[PDB]
Amino acid sequence: VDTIDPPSHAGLEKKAEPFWHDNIRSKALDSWTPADLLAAVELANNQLYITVLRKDLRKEERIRGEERDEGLIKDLRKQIVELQRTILAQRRDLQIHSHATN
Amino acid sequence: DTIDPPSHAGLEKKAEPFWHDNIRSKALDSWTPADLLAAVELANNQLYITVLRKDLRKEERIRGEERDEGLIKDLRKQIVELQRTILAQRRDLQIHSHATN
Amino acid sequence: AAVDTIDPPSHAGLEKKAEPFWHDNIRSKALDSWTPADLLAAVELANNQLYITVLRKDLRKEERIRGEERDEGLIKDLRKQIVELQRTILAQRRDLQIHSHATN
Amino acid sequence: VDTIDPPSHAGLEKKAEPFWHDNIRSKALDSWTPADLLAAVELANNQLYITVLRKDLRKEERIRGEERDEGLIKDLRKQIVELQRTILAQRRDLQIHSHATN
Amino acid sequence: AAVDTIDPPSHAGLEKKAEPFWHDNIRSKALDSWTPADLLAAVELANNQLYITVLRKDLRKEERIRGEERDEGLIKDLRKQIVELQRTILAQRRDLQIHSHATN
Amino acid sequence: DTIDPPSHAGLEKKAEPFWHDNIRSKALDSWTPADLLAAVELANNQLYITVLRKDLRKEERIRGEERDEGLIKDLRKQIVELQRTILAQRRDLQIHSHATN
Amino acid sequence: DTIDPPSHAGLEKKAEPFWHDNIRSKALDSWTPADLLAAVELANNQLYITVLRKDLRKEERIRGEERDEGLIKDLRKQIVELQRTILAQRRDLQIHSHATN
């Protein structure tokens, strides 16, 4: 009663569900249009994905010597920053950035 | 409660549920023919993210010599670029939240 | 022209298959607000909208190819070309005042 | 009586003339300064040139097999987009974009 | 949580050593103005602030190396990564309304 | 009805008709010495587009082994960059249409 | 008349005089804990410019075969990027001049 189910067609990853519900609960339930719900799937999927990439990054950072892959480490660092910046834009698009909600 | 997509614009069949969600997010009488064309591309992009994510997750499950790090990197970026484009497409159609709330 | 539209300027080279896109755009603001300059710009808008469908067909063909003949570089380039067309179209809509903010 | 001749020194291509006159007729004749007329030559030349590049592109796209030039196709696609974006800026500079005229 | 802060959302994966950064940020606007969405965003802010200190340690280690084993490329990349994190953090602060313009 | 260009700025001789067109597009008394320097570069750029287009068209007429696709690509871009610069130069001088209309 | 830096943020010891100068440039009661974290990075960057300039000047004094033009170029750019970042960091903290004057 205090949230909204994700649209099935949009492919919310199951592990993104706790992120999804946090975002839905950050503005009035009646202000979520069907279009907004589609966009919110991608926000939640991105927030989940940062945690996945950070795990990969930390794994690669623990490797020392010949098998260490500096290129992959560099790429993962950048991918995380790009996701973070995208998420800020996604929040603003949904009016769940702080300026709107606070 | 909705509008049929313009045939010439080539809405992908699996993009239909995305299409209808977007059409239902502003008043039916505010959809111009130009807007309907733009909305086909929005829906096609929203569908396509799901397609590229499926490809990405497949590549991520591959371990060892056949794993393709370059392809993984390229797919990650393609998804981000689609997402950013979709935000612009929503604003162009006035179905971003600032307009509809 | 039909009484609810405008013919495209011949010199601008509207593609035949772009015609249904053209008419959709023309019909999205008042007929009397289309200047001759705007009509030139609208040809390029319609041509771009058509061209996305053409590139998507090429892309889907390339995506169905598996094994040695698959061309990952071409697939990457087509994905980007479609996004660049889409973004250009948004600017072209705004330039013509047929984006939603203007019309709705 | 309803248009203006292009400045000879500016090098309007002859096939760009129908584009030129369309643009001149899109704001009041008395609002065309000599500076604007120079700028309008380049607008018209660019609008013509898109049609030229599209013809080249379509020619290259019809070629299949060993002689197909994917690099040239990619370059022409980008050149057309860059011209289109430039033309939007050129229209705004001349106040013949729709916001000004409509 | 302590009565002047908020627990981080477990699913977001706040790093243990990011906790003191987390609490500093939470305590920089009213507790009741933290939406669940904001709390997710704040995890990434805190994780980034921690990560700068980690990268700076790696950088300083590489800078102490002289001769054949010195890796100028890695040093260059780490310098840039730190600047990119710093710039991202400024955007993350503004998104949360904990930049100075909002709070002061 | 016009102003002589500052000699030190090196207005190209064939840029003169461009120069005078620009000078005549705002009040003569509003041309500061600084503006006159900037206007030399505007006129020189407007002339130079015509020069580069002549080179480009020459290269485009060449077919076969001597055709230089790289040079053609570079000239196309140089022209676009000049055009975009000219728009900025017009705005800097307040001879863009928004100012003069 | 000042505030201690948060230990977890890793203010470099030689950055301390920079830190205190920045803290003293707006009211003490307007420094939130979040601002104090951001100010550590500002001070660390201000210190680091001096470090990179020392390295740059050392490389510039080298003549002949051991001179490293690539390193010189990279250091020049790193300094400019730090400087630009610092301007953004000042604005974020409202210690740029527009805010404090």
Add this chain to the structure above:
Amino acid sequence: AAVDTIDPPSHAGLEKKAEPFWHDNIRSKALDSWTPADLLAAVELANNQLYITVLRKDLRKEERIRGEERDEGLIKDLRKQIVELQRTILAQRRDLQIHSHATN
């Protein structure tokens, strides 16, 4: 200085041939509105305006060369350097409030 201008600051290194550019710029806003900081900035503006003429001379020389000694790369680089100077000069004018919007 002549009574309608200001001497350049010696430490800033105004090029001798940049002097006529310098004086044109100084004379484009009130003498009393030139701060010492502005005078430093104006040295760089004048030096850039002079330098365009220098680069254009080099470019025209290279453009007259035909055959094996022609250096297309250098020609390309000089064209871009001139455009970058021109764009920088517009920003330098605005920074000094001697762009037309300010003065006219």
Add this chain to the structure above:
Amino acid sequence: VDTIDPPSHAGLEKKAEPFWHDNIRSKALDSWTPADLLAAVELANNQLYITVLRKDLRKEERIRGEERDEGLIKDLRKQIVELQRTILAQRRDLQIHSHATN
């Protein structure tokens, strides 16, 4: 009495001192915060450094034949432009750009 000493820790280069004092004298002495003084060191250092790089550039430009280094010439030209653009931002940050002072 009409200027301010630079903060020692900030590493103002000695040859940048005349630039420093010119900038300090371009707004009211009481409006220079300690933070502004740090920033002003980097402004002055950059203004000095343009003169240094121009000297290097002119030296390289006088070299003809096999020893001429076109890459270095290109890099120095760009470095000067980047410094100049940075200085404009540094002036605005300190409110000693003309819009603020005039």
